[PDB]
Design a protein around this ligand. Structure first.
Ligand SMILES: *[C@@H]1O[C@H](CO)[C@@H](O[C@@H]2O[C@H](CO)[C@@H](O)[C@H](O)[C@H]2NC(C)=O)[C@H](O)[C@H]1NC(C)=O
Ligand SMILES: *[C@@H]1O[C@H](CO)[C@@H](O[C@@H]2O[C@H](CO)[C@@H](O)[C@H](O)[C@H]2NC(C)=O)[C@H](O)[C@H]1NC(C)=O
Ligand SMILES: *[C@@H]1O[C@H](CO)[C@@H](O[C@@H]2O[C@H](CO)[C@@H](O)[C@H](O)[C@H]2NC(C)=O)[C@H](O)[C@H]1NC(C)=O
Ligand SMILES: *[C@@H]1O[C@H](CO)[C@@H](O[C@@H]2O[C@H](CO)[C@@H](O)[C@H](O)[C@H]2NC(C)=O)[C@H](O)[C@H]1NC(C)=O
Ligand SMILES: *[C@@H]1O[C@H](CO)[C@@H](O[C@@H]2O[C@H](CO)[C@@H](O)[C@H](O)[C@H]2NC(C)=O)[C@H](O)[C@H]1NC(C)=O
Ligand SMILES: *[C@@H]1O[C@H](CO)[C@@H](O[C@@H]2O[C@H](CO)[C@@H](O)[C@H](O)[C@H]2NC(C)=O)[C@H](O)[C@H]1NC(C)=O
Ligand SMILES: *[C@@H]1O[C@H](CO)[C@@H](O[C@@H]2O[C@H](CO)[C@@H](O)[C@H](O)[C@H]2NC(C)=O)[C@H](O)[C@H]1NC(C)=O
Ligand SMILES: *[C@@H]1O[C@H](CO)[C@@H](O[C@@H]2O[C@H](CO)[C@@H](O)[C@H](O)[C@H]2NC(C)=O)[C@H](O)[C@H]1NC(C)=O
Ligand SMILES: *[C@@H]1O[C@H](CO)[C@@H](O[C@@H]2O[C@H](CO)[C@@H](O)[C@H](O)[C@H]2NC(C)=O)[C@H](O)[C@H]1NC(C)=O
Ligand code: NAG
Ligand code: NAG
Ligand code: NAG
Ligand code: NAG
Lengths: 55, 81, 280, 149, 162, 198, 50
């Protein structure tokens, strides 16, 4: 099964405290409205990072 | 895994839906940073004595907004539309 | 302070470039000086300070929506209050400085003086017609002045004396409509926001160009001075002066170019105030 | 102050007006220094005391962290041949604090030690161990003739 | 602080850090708060006061004394008179209002008669005796001559390269 | 003009600005700009081409930058002077060759005429103006009712000295008796506010 | 208007000034500026990065 990941996978990029500011960053993120694959002991690829959700 | 460093982030929140990922926004606070230096190409989960979604990250430019207390409230994906 | 952030060796090295700093300071000083003459030529056209009498027998017109109100913060009127609220503050005390070397000076004329000038001009216009521009004020009833003013466009003066109430009601309704339009819509004041936006954006562009390598090994002077020996660090101190100098020169040139048009607009406003408020 | 005004205008007569002469900054004193809370000795000595080295096609690497690194003790040694130290400087190395240190060790003939530097070509620099274009910490080559001869 | 070098006054900061940051800041890389590596506490940093000076003088020909205006600085750490454009030293304060020759700023200006500073007077005040059944007509007249000067050109100069 | 000085501040300011800019330009020729000497003759007579060319390059780029800055400032100043000259030509055309009806353009008052005079780098206008004085205030009325008819003045204004009514011009005080040759009738007077019996 | 030449001068000077400015801008791309060669591809293809 496949599912839409609306706005999941946003983390803190750096160890710097900021407040009341809009910051433009460039890094490895999960694209918005991406296509996540439901699973159910299979070996999986690790391209450049893995977002691993759970329920 | 970036240039010899292995980083793990995490989060834990309750949800009301029972079908899929809910609609909302919440940032992830880092837990573990390791200076290992070996590379990884494949991985495999482990069981105890269910389901799990797997997505892949890609290089992209985001625009984050910080609130008064320093917590991210929303973000914009530049390369969408 | 902008080029060589609180350092000594950089200041010494900058002396070899001649005198590429009196020009920038002098140009900025000239702009700042003319920015006060611009305001002085417009409003400061009245000699005395007139004030409206307690008598409010103007024939039917009510100017209460534009005459000053004593129970106000700056003794302004309703329209001025709306205009102030519809334009997007460091005026509480002395808090104007910056670590980079940029400061904002306060204007010579505070807003209370501008309000007093406008009130004096309005009171003189209402109570003395156009005679207060040439010599001394000559009091004259408002209805007779309006009958004189119709005679200047072709219409005889018996039209006003027989249709006074209709004209007064039309003027009051027009004033109310202007009040409602100003209160509801805030996009009318589009000309006064462009200048502020341009100035703020240019200053932001100037500030944002300090974290640039320009070919050196770091964007901060202290770390270069605290990591390299000083018979070789002078090579990397250069290639940083030559960029921060060009940025400042570009900013100064753009400021001069966009101050010329403000001077032209100030001249136009002075002319309009001269031959459209005082006379007909 | 009037003398300063005359200096600024470069004249002996000043007319009515307001002039800008100079500026003043508060002078700071009593400097303070704060550093981390560990005092363990660092194993830098073991790297140079290494009895065996490796070959250039497979060079030995060690990652160094959590140290109080002293370089004056190693700098003052007069047993080294070449110590051209790029990057920052030798003498100021004691005043800087880093995050990680990489130590790379091998052995090479005497005619190629001139070739361990960025921005140049050859055989060994291009096909055995290539330094990046930005910099290296710095390279230290010392004579050891009895060990492998 | 661990290789971070700077100058300023250290104050007990109030902003709350998450347990994993090391130092805070604001727009355009201005370090605003740092945690010390020994007591773990948080301290905010701001530079101490600085700024330009100006000299107000009546001219060498008239007098040989001046006043000094420190721009944009609280005169509690520099008769001292506190203005809105800085603070003035060497000029006394008068509560009368005149027309002034040397402007300072924020409605405050100083002059010479010494070296007093006051608020500029807008002009002479009068009230016109308005009424709805009376007018005022002149009886006499005067002929006045006024002069005005306008520039039209400047010198023609040429500069070569070689 | 003979006694009081500093009446020609604009021309003096223009000359001062021009001379100061030129002096600053000529003063930049003595800067090192990072080379070994500030004069080409010594550099050329003391070294060989391989690095003498570097020194010459440094000096050339510095001097070229200074020249460009000077040219830009001169362009701005020339534009301002052109605007001022256009204003002066306009003022001449309207005020010397005719009579100006636009207020405060030429002089303070009612304009009569003007005279031009030359200047070292400009022009001086002398404006002749008419200014009233010795005011006196009377009682007025907008119209006069005679036999049920409302009379208004053709040009002028109704005034009374206390017992009698006259018509006088606006800018000067000369009284005339009210006849039918200077007033015109417009209907009856029951809606006009301020009518007086006479 | 249809007989005497050089009557619409000002527009012609404006057009000529714009054309000359654009031409002298596009003409500066061939200058050496103190480098080995004015062509960038060849100078990259003939020397090492340093
Ligand atoms: C930012 O932080 C402040 C303080 O930590 C939050 O204010 C608290 O809000 C909670 C819930 O409304 C109250 O129980 C506390 O009493 C508040 N504390 C104070 C000091 O006011 C605030 O909610 C946070 N978020 C925002 C958007 O300000
Ligand atoms: C002029 O006319 C306006 C329009 O009505 C008057 O404004 C209102 O006046 C009444 C009468 O006192 C007040 O009850 C209202 O509160 C006024 N409106 C507002 C928004 O305040 C105004 O008072 C008149 N002025 C004079 C001097 O008669
Ligand atoms: C001339 O126009 C005005 C308005 O444009 C007319 O005045 C209006 O007349 C209507 C009908 O009597 C009234 O309901 C309105 O209240 C009037 N307006 C005002 C402001 O009082 C006027 O009647 C027109 N003239 C003629 C001769 O018809
Ligand atoms: C191996 O380690 C030892 C001890 O850490 C080093 O011996 C020191 O050498 C210096 C330089 O001659 C002397 O000043 C010290 O007194 C010595 N200390 C001891 C305890 O012997 C030795 O130099 C190291 N060898 C290498 C090749 O690095
Ligand atoms: C000069 O410094 C003093 C000391 O801080 C200032 O006094 C405080 O100023 C702040 C705002 O700058 C106010 O919020 C406090 O209420 C003031 N406290 C006291 C006890 O006065 C002072 O305002 C500064 N400026 C001047 C002109 O004195
Ligand atoms: C004009 O009539 C008034 C009636 O008194 C006079 O002018 C005013 O005089 C009072 C003093 O009672 C002043 O408060 C007003 O300011 C005056 N109004 C002005 C100057 O506009 C005066 O007597 C009459 N004018 C002449 C020339 O006699
Ligand atoms: C000003 O206008 C008023 C009327 O608009 C004139 O007379 C008024 O007459 C009534 C009686 O019908 C009195 O109650 C008022 O007191 C009068 N007005 C005033 C202001 O007292 C008045 O004559 C006109 N002229 C003057 C100088 O007031
Ligand atoms: C208002 O003006 C009229 C006309 O000038 C004055 O009437 C004359 O007054 C003089 C005073 O000596 C008499 O000699 C004349 O005979 C009067 N003329 C007529 C036709 O009777 C009148 O006196 C003036 N009023 C005031 C108060 O000065
Ligand atoms: C001007 O004269 C007319 C006519 O003499 C006056 O109108 C009369 O006034 C009286 C008293 O109020 C009334 O009884 C009459 O009915 C009115 N009409 C006529 C035809 O006599 C008028 O009042 C006078 N105006 C002034 C200001 O005195
Ligand atoms: C996800 O992928 C599946 C199979 O490739 C496809 O059927 C589905 O439409 C995709 N969903 C989105 C949102 O792209
Ligand atoms: C630093 O070390 C001292 C002495 O061991 C100790 O008292 C202090 O608590 C330490 N600071 C920390 C752990 O933040
Ligand atoms: C100097 O001042 C005196 C009196 O104030 C005055 O007469 C004289 O002209 C002044 N000198 C100059 C050069 O202005
Ligand atoms: C200013 O001086 C006058 C002198 O009489 C005095 O009455 C007044 O109180 C003074 N103002 C202040 C604010 O001290």
């Amino acid at each position: 099964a496949y599912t839409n990941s609306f706005t999941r996978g946003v983390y803190y990029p750096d160890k710097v405290f900021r407040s009341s500011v809009l910051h433009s960053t460039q890094d490895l993120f999960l694209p918005f409205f991406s296509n996540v694959t439901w699973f159910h002991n299979p070996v999986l690829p690790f391209n450049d990072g893995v977002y691993f959700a759970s329920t | 895994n970036i240039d010899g460093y292995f980083k793990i982030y995490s989060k834990h929140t309750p949800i009301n839906l029972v079908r899929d990922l809910p609609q909302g926004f919440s940032a992830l606070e880092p837990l573990v940073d390791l200076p290992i230096g070996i590379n990884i190409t494949r991985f495999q989960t482990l069981l105890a004595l269910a389901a799990y979604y797997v997505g892949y990250l890609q290089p992209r430019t985001f625009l984050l907004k910080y609130n008064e207390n320093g917590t991210i409230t929303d973000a914009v994906d530049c390369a969408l539309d | 302070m902008y080029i060589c952030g609180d350092s000594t060796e950089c200041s010494n090295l900058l002396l070899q470039y001649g005198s590429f700093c009196t020009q920038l300071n002098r140009a900025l000083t000239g702009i700042a000086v003319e920015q006060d003459k611009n305001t002085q030529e417009v409003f400061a056209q009245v000699k005395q300070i007139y004030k409206t009498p307690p008598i409010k027998d103007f024939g039917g017109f009510n100017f209460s929506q534009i005459l000053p109100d004593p129970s106000k913060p700056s003794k302004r009127s309703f329209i001025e209050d709306l205009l102030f609220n519809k334009v997007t503050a460091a005026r509480d005390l002395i808090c104007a400085q910056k670590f980079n070397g940029l400061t904002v000076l306060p204007p010579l004329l505070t807003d209370e003086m501008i309000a007093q000038y406008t009130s004096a001009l309005l009171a003189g216009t209402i109570t003395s017609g156009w005679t207060f521009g040439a010599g001394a004020a000559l009091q004259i009833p408002f209805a007779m002045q309006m009958a004189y003013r119709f005679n200047g466009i072709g219409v005889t003066q018996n039209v006003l004396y027989e249709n006074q109430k209709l004209i007064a009601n039309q003027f009051n309704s027009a004033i109310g409509k202007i009040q409602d339009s100003l209160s509801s819509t805030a996009s009318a004041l589009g000309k006064l926001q462009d200048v502020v936006n341009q100035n703020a954006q240019a200053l932001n562009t100037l500030v944002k160009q300090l974290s640039s390598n320009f070919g050196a090994i770091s964007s901060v002077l202290n770390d270069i001075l605290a990591r390299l020996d000083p018979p070789e660090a002078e090579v990397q101190i250069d290639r940083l002066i030559t960029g921060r100098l060009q940025s400042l020169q570009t900013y100064v040139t753009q400021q001069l170019i966009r101050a010329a048009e403000i001077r032209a607009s100030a001249n136009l406003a002075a002319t309009k105030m001269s031959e459209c408020v005082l006379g007909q | 102050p009037l003398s300063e005004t005359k200096c600024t205008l470069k004249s002996f007569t000043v007319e009515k007006g307001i002039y800008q002469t100079s500026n003043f900054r508060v002078q700071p004193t009593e400097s303070i220094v704060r550093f981390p809370n560990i005092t363990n000795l660092c194993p830098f000595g073991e790297v140079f005391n290494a009895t065996r080295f490796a070959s250039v096609y497979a060079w030995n690497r060690k990652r160094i962290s959590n140290c109080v690194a002293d370089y004056s003790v190693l700098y003052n040694s007069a047993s080294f041949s070449t110590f051209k130290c790029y990057g920052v400087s030798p003498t100021k190395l004691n005043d800087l604090c880093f995050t990680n240190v990489y130590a790379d060790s091998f052995v090479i003939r005497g005619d190629e030690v001139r070739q361990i530097a960025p921005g140049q070509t050859g055989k060994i620099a291009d096909y055995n161990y290539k330094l990046p274009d930005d910099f290296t910490g710095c390279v230290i080559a010392w004579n050891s003739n009895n060990l492998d001869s | 602080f661990n290789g971070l070098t700077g100058t300023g006054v250290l104050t007990e900061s109030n902003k709350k850090f998450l347990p994993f940051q090391q130092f805070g800041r604001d727009i355009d890389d201005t370090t605003d708060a740092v945690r010390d590596p020994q007591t773990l506490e948080i301290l905010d940093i701001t530079p101490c006061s600085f700024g330009g000076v100006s000299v107000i003088t009546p001219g060498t020909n008239t007098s040989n004394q001046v006043a000094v205006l420190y721009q944009g600085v609280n005169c509690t750490e520099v008769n001292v008179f506190q203005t809105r454009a800085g603070c003035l030293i060497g000029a006394e304060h008068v509560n009368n209002s005149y027309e002034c020759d040397i402007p300072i700023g924020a409605g405050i200006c100083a002059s010479y008669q010494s070296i007093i500073a006051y608020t500029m007077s807008l002009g002479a005040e009068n009230s016109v005796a308005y009424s709805n059944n009376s007018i005022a007509i002149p009886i006499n007249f005067t002929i006045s001559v006024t002069t005005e000067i306008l520039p039209v050109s400047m010198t023609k100069t040429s500069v070569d390269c070689t | 003009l003979s006694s009081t000085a500093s009446a020609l501040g604009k021309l003096q300011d223009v000359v001062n600005q021009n001379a100061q800019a030129l002096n600053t330009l000529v003063k930049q020729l003595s800067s090192n700009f990072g080379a070994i000497s500030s004069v080409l003759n010594d550099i050329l007579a003391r070294l060989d081409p391989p690095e003498a060319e570097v020194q010459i390059d440094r000096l050339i780029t510095g001097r070229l930058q200074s020249l460009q800055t000077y040219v830009t400032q001169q362009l701005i100043r020339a534009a301002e002077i052109r605007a001022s000259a256009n204003l002066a030509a306009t003022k001449m055309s309207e005020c010397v060759l005719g009579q100006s009806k636009r207020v405060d353009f030429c002089g303070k008052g009612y304009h009569l005429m003007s005279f031009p005079q030359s200047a070292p780098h400009g022009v001086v206008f002398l404006h002749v103006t008419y200014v009233p004085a010795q005011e006196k205030n009377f009682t007025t009325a907008p119209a006069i009712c005679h036999d049920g008819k409302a009379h208004f003045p053709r040009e002028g204004v109704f005034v009374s000295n206390g017992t009698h009514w006259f018509v006088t011009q606006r800018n000067f005080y000369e009284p005339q008796i009210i006849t039918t040759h200077n007033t015109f009738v417009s209907g009856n007077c029951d809606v006009v506010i301020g009518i007086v019996n006479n």
